[PDB]
Amino acid sequence: MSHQKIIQDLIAWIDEHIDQPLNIDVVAKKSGYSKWYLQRMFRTVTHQTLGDYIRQRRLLLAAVELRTTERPIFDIAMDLGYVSQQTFSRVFRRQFDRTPSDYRHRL
DNA sequence: ATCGCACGGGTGGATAAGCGTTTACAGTTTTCGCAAGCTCGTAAAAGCAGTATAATGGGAGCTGTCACGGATGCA
């Protein structure tokens, strides 16, 4: 089994469990590998990062929880690896170039 | 393969501070509304003086009955 089949399984590993507290100590242990070694092979298969991409699906989930659900900004961050919305609102100007308040207005 | 270690990138984390937006909790101004209290007015209630043939002593339904002592008080 080549490693390009490993990371193909890893793209369906998280697509249901980004609302869960999913950390690297779960992803590495339930893959059969170590904590660091999964990140070296992750570059040569999809050209992007791993610890930011789980945020990139988490910040994708916050936008589809804002354009559909009435949940506030402060405690969507509580389930997605943040302890407050102060940093969680800040990276959204990097990921989608918008404010977490301004997305729901422009339809 | 299996996995750390490091230089360094990215960040998360702990105060902190930011932003425009729609109401508090501070204090007075305004108007309107209806009284409780005073003043009043007169029709009703309240009070007062007089009435010139002549008239001059209650009882007025009472009590219908018991009988034994003490003090009182004339005689």
Curated annotation (Swiss-Prot):
InterPro entries: Homeodomain-like_sf (IPR009057), HTH_AraC (IPR018060), HTH_AraC-typ_CS (IPR018062), MarA-like (IPR050959), Tscrpt_reg_AraC-type_HTH (IPR020449). The keyword Repeat does not apply. The lineage of its organism: Bacteria, Pseudomonadati, Pseudomonadota, Gammaproteobacteria, Enterobacterales. One of its GO terms (biological process) is regulation of DNA-templated transcription. GO terms for cellular component: cytosol. This is Regulatory protein SoxS. It is found in: Cytoplasm. One of its GO terms (molecular function) is sequence-specific DNA binding. It comes from the Bacteria. Disulfide bonds: none annotated. Keywords: Activator, Cytoplasm, DNA-binding, Transcription, Transcription regulation. Residues 8-106 form the HTH araC/xylS-type domain. Induction: By paraquat. Residues 25-46, 73-96 bind DNA. PANTHER family: REGULATORY PROTEIN SOXS, RIGHT ORIGIN-BINDING PROTEIN. Signal peptide: none annotated. Transcriptional activator of the superoxide response regulon of E.coli that includes at least 10 genes such as sodA, nfo, zwf and micF. Binds the DNA sequence 5'-GCACN(7)CAA-3'. It also facilitates the subsequent binding of RNA polymerase to the micF and the nfo promoters. NCBIfam families: PRK10219.1 (NF007584). Gene3D superfamilies: Homeodomain-like (1.10.10.60).
